[PDB]
């Protein structure tokens, strides 16, 4: 089944022109689309209804939309609406013109500490909003931490997300395999908000070190290292940053910081956080003083 | 970790006395130092080994030294040797007593055309030597164009410099952010010797106009102007000078003059070049 050249909404009679191809997310394909009337450009997620025939996939799609449409925060990908024809489901999302932290990490590898801190603070602010709205993402990775023109982080891809119905509710079932598998998900012990802090722990490590904390050449060794909490922080990592990674990457979920305690860590409160990053930071490391002061030209 | 009062070389047993503070280059600190034996005064670059613990910083430091130690030209800062203790790396460089073109430009702003031509010819001569030795500086700015007692230009600071291994090699990765970002570096398209001509273009503009060609109050507008090659030459600039700036500041790297063609421009061949500049030119405009 071919994808339509123009995407028409039965209800609001809104019509979008299928522009540049952006990429595919497993089962879904993503295109740059523009409203023919207003000329406003969006990120169109397009899922073949042929691949939703399995009821367990319809649950996943409906749950993703239900969660994403209820969210509105400057560090969460905007949800502008959804619709369907008889062949495809169309989801209209905020366009983040600088792709995601995955593309940045592939080009730059290890970031400077101020860059890491700049990105991580926004990731935590976004996740804080989710957790306060009783949402667990359960699949935070570089690839779904999107970047807009101003290099502001936007959390997207709620494909594995669940809503907590009461305070201390623990979940078992996932409709897919998270990128950063927390030890309580691997052991099938039940999980809550703490999985998001684990993945933020893996993300922080990757940004500062330039490679993942657990990932090896084979998944069998990868998952054994996660089970036994076997990872090594290079001595070149600063003591405050090293400390915060150790807090987040703990086997005991109750031992990890909450998202509120995470934001109030010395790493953020006592560390230099740039107000802006120059656009050159996508490809080349920026200059920072040993002791940056807001009393300087 | 405190910096030693006297700097001792394990090999050669050479010993220098840490004199007047000259300034800091981001991660490095620079001091006026003198050989206790010969009394010869040098510029000592001192880098804490604590800040080199990240291997990708050790590559940058070793590459800078490797390139700089292989160079010997009257328009390139002399490299007299390097050594280390367990806490610091020490690099001994030629002392340029009149600092750099940045300090001159801050005091004088727009130079006269003969002054501009005098400085630019030496900058090009230095860069010509680099390019002939398959070296791209990639960070030429007023701040690393140093001036000796006689106001002769010396190119220093090979912190972002790379050596070209083969004919037609194009480079991607920079270990820092150049002051004058060429459009092919901004677009991550690959770059070669042409970036040096771009920066010489920006430098020539700044010397004659008294402000940078692209730099605005915000970096977002600055980088958009570079991408689209949006800049304005004041009508008061002479036509031959204006022409040469237009040749160097082109988006297409292949369209720019080479460093050899640059030197043979009408601006240099047909323009008045002073043999010397008087020391008063640091603070007040000279007569010709
Ligand atoms: C299905 C798609 O969903 C999106 C897309 C979004 N998106 C918004 N603006 C964007 C600008 C560019 C890119 C391009 N992709 C290429 C692959 N890369 C790993 C991430 C950026 C994607 C952009 S947000 C969002 C979401 N679900 O919230 C998606 C989700 C997760 C990983 C990859 C994609 C996909 F590759 F398909 F794009
Ligand atoms: C790290 C240092 O390295 C040097 C220093 C050199 N140098 C030689 N004689 C000199 C007389 C005075 C001054 C002082 N600076 C103050 C700042 N100004 C922008 C330039 C002159 C520096 C002199 S040459 C040279 C080099 N790497 O080739 C350096 C490189 C680039 C910009 C600044 C400095 C630093 F500020 F640290 F000095
Ligand atoms: Cl990992």
> Read out DSSP for chain A?
-PPPSEEE-TTT--EEEEEEEEEEETTEEEEEEEETTT--EEEEEEEEGGGG-SHHHHHHHHHHHHHHHT---TTB--EEEEEE-SSEEEEEE---TT-BHHHHHHHH-SPPHHHHHHHHHHHHHHHHHHHHTTEE-S---GGGEEE-TT--EEE---TT-EE-SSTT--B---SS--SS--HHHHTT--B-THHHHHHHHHHHHHHHHSS-SS--SSHHHHHHHHHHT-----TTS-HHHHHHHHHHS-SSGGGSPPHHHHHTSHHHHSS---S---GGGGTSPPP--SS--SS--
| Spatial distance between the Cα atoms of A284 and A280, rounded to a whole number of angstroms | 6
- Tell which atom from ligand 1 comes closest to the C-alpha of A156: 28
Contact A268, A122 (CB under 8 A): no
| Spatial distance between the Cα atoms of B185 and B190, rounded to a whole number of angstroms | 7
Q: Cβ–Cβ contacts within 10 Å for residue A163, how many?
A: 14
Residue A280 to residue B26, Cβ atoms within 8 A:
no
Q: Are B43 and B128 in the same domain? A: no
Q: Look up tokens 């001091």; give the residue.
A: B31
| Spatial distance between the Cα atoms of B229 and B249, rounded to a whole number of angstroms | 8
Nominal resolution (angstroms) = 2.6
Which neighbouring-strand residues pair with B145?
B155
DSSP for residue B101:
H
Task: Tell me how far the alpha carbon of residue B157 lies from the centroid of ligand 2, in angstroms.
Answer: 8
Closest CA–CA distance from residue A113 to any residue of chain B (Å): 12
Helix, strand, coil percent content, chain B, rounded in steps of 5:
35, 20, 45
DSSP for residue B285:
P
Q: Look up tokens 């800078």; give the residue.
A: B64
Q: Are A86 and A121 in the same domain? A: no
Q: Are B162 and B263 in the same domain? A: yes
Q: Are A158 and A259 in the same domain? A: yes
Q: Considering only CA atoms, which of A155, A151, A136 is closest in space to residue A93?
A: A155
Q: Are A84 and A210 in the same domain? A: no
Q: Look up tokens 């970002």; give the residue.
A: B181
Contact B286, B280 (CB under 8 A): yes
DSSP for residue B12:
T
Q: Are A113 and A147 in the same domain? A: yes
β A145-147/A153-155 pair status = antiparallel
Ion ligand 3 neighbours (CB, 5 A) are A 212-215
Is B227 annotated among the ligand-binding residues? no
Q: Are A149 and A47 in the same domain? A: no
Q: Considering only CA atoms, which of B180, B187, B152, B169 is closest in space to residue B248?
A: B180
Q: Are B222 and B271 in the same domain? A: yes
Cα distance from N-terminal residue to C-terminal residue, chain A? 59
| Spatial distance between the Cα atoms of A195 and A201, rounded to a whole number of angstroms | 10
DSSP for residue B171:
B
CATH code: domain of residue B148? 1.10.510.10
Residues of B near A (Cβ–Cβ under 8 Å) read: 26-27, 51, 53-56, 172-177, 181, 185-186, 188, 219-220, 223
Q: Are A159 and A246 in the same domain? A: yes
Contact A283, B226 (CB under 8 A): no
Give the rounded distance of the alpha carbon of B181 from its chain centre. 14
Q: Considering only CA atoms, which of B146, B115, B152 is closest in space to residue B281?
A: B115
Contacts of B219 in chain A (CB under 8 A): 276, 278-279
Whether residue B54 lies inside any domain: the answer is yes
Backbone angles phi, psi at B167, to 5 degrees: -65, 120
The method of structure determination was X-ray
* Exposed/middle/buried for residue B166 (C-beta within 10 Å: 0-12, 13-18, 19+): exposed
Is A30 annotated among the ligand-binding residues? yes
Whether residue B267 lies inside any domain: the answer is yes
> What is A24-73 written as a DSSP string?
EETTEEEEEEEETTT--EEEEEEEEGGGG-SHHHHHHHHHHHHHHHT---
Q: Look up tokens 């949006």; give the residue.
A: B230
Q: Cβ–Cβ contacts within 10 Å for residue A70, how many?
A: 12
For chain A, the farthest-separated pair of C-alpha atoms sits apart, in whole angstroms, at: 61
| Spatial distance between the Cα atoms of A255 and B271, rounded to a whole number of angstroms | 75
Q: What's the number of domains chain A is made of?
A: 2
Contact A148, A154 (CB under 8 A): yes
Whether residue B239 lies inside any domain: the answer is yes
Whether residue B5 lies inside any domain: the answer is no
| Spatial distance between the Cα atoms of B185 and A7, rounded to a whole number of angstroms | 38
Whether residue A257 lies inside any domain: the answer is yes
Q: How many beta-carbon pairs under 8 angstroms link A with B?
A: 40
CA distances from B52 to A175, A204, A237, B67, B87 (A): 45, 21, 12, 18, 10
Q: Are B153 and B207 in the same domain? A: yes
Q: At B282, which helix (H) or strand (E)?
A: none
Task: Mark which of B93, B111, B134 sits at the end of a domain.
Answer: B93
Q: What is the domain range of residue A131? A: 101-275
Q: Are B162 and B27 in the same domain? A: no
| Residue A35 token pair | 């409203």
Q: At B246, which helix (H) or strand (E)?
A: helix B239-248
* Exposed/middle/buried for residue B204 (C-beta within 10 Å: 0-12, 13-18, 19+): buried
Contact A160, A175 (CB under 8 A): yes
Residue B176 to residue A290, Cβ atoms within 8 A:
no
DSSP for residue B76:
B
Contacts of A279 in chain B (CB under 8 A): 186, 219-220, 223
Contacts of A284 in chain B (CB under 8 A): 173-174, 176-177, 185
Which three-class secondary structure state does DSSP give residue B124? helix
Contact B258, B124 (CB under 8 A): no
Whether residue B176 lies inside any domain: the answer is yes
| E strand segments, chain B | 6-8, 15-25, 28-35, 41-48, 79-84, 88-93, 135-136, 145-147, 153-155, 162-163
| Spatial distance between the Cα atoms of A204 and B258, rounded to a whole number of angstroms | 45
Q: Are B141 and B269 in the same domain? A: yes
CATH code: domain of residue B19? 3.30.200.20
Selected catalytic residue, list A37, A139, A167, A265: A139
Task: Mark which of B93, B124, B157 sits at the end of a domain.
Answer: B93
Contact B94, B80 (CB under 8 A): yes
DSSP for residue B56:
H
Task: Mark which of B49, B74, B93 sits at the end of a domain.
Answer: B93
Whether residue A249 lies inside any domain: the answer is yes
Q: Which long-range contacts (CB under 8 A, 24 or more apart) does B162-170 make?
A: B162/B63, B162/B67, B162/B135, B162/B136, B162/B138, B163/B66, B163/B67, B163/B134, B163/B135, B164/B134, B164/B135, B164/B136, B164/B192, B164/B193, B165/B134, B168/B192
| Spatial distance between the Cα atoms of B177 and B220, rounded to a whole number of angstroms | 15
Give the rounded distance of the alpha carbon of B188 from its chain centre. 22
CA distances from A37 to A11, A14, A21, A78, B245 (A): 16, 8, 21, 20, 44
Q: Considering only CA atoms, which of B220, B29, B201, B20 is closest in space to residue B123?
A: B201
Whether residue A4 lies inside any domain: the answer is no
| Spatial distance between the Cα atoms of B206 and B233, rounded to a whole number of angstroms | 11
Task: Tell me how far the alpha carbon of residue B71 lies from the centroid of ligand 3, in angstroms.
Answer: 45
Q: Cβ–Cβ contacts within 10 Å for residue A38, how many?
A: 8
| Residue B9 token pair | 């070389």
């Amino acid at each position: 089944k071919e994808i339509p050249e123009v995407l028409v909404d039965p209800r609001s009679r809104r019509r979008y022109v299928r522009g540049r191809f952006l990429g595919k997310g497993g089962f879904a394909k993503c295109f740059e689309i523009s409203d023919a009337d207003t000329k406003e450009v969006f990120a169109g997620k397009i899922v073949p209804k042929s691949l939703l025939l399995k009821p367990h996939q319809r649950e996943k799609m409906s749950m993703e939309i239900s969660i994403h449409r209820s969210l509105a925060h400057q560090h969460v990908v905007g949800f502008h609406g959804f619709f369907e024809d008889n062949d495809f489901v169309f989801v209209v999302l905020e366009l983040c013109r600088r792709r995601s932290l995955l593309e940045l990490h592939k080009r730059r590898k290890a970031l400077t500490e101020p860059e890491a801190r700049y990105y991580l603070r926004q990731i935590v602010l976004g996740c804080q909003y989710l957790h306060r709205n009783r949402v667990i993402h359960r699949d935070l990775k570089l690839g779904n931490l999107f970047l807009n023109e101003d290099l502001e982080v936007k959390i997207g891809d709620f494909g594995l997300a669940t809503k907590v119905e009461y305070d201390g509710e623990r979940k078992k079932t996932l409709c897919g395999t998270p990128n950063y598998i927390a030890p309580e998900v691997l052991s099938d012990a039940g999980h809550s908000f703490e999985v998001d802090v684990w993945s933020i722990g893996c993300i922080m490590y990757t940004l500062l070190v330039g490679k993942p904390p657990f990932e090896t050449s084979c998944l069998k060794e990868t998952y054994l290292r996660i089970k036994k909490n076997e990872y090594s922080i290079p001595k070149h990592i600063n003591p405050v940053a090293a400390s915060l990674i150790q807090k987040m990457l703990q086997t005991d979920p109750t031992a990890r910081p909450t998202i509120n305690e995470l934001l109030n860590d010395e790493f953020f409160t006592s560390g230099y956080i740039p107000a802006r990053l120059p656009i050159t930071c996508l490809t080349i490391p920026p200059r920072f003083s040993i002791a940056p002061s807001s009393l300087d030209p």
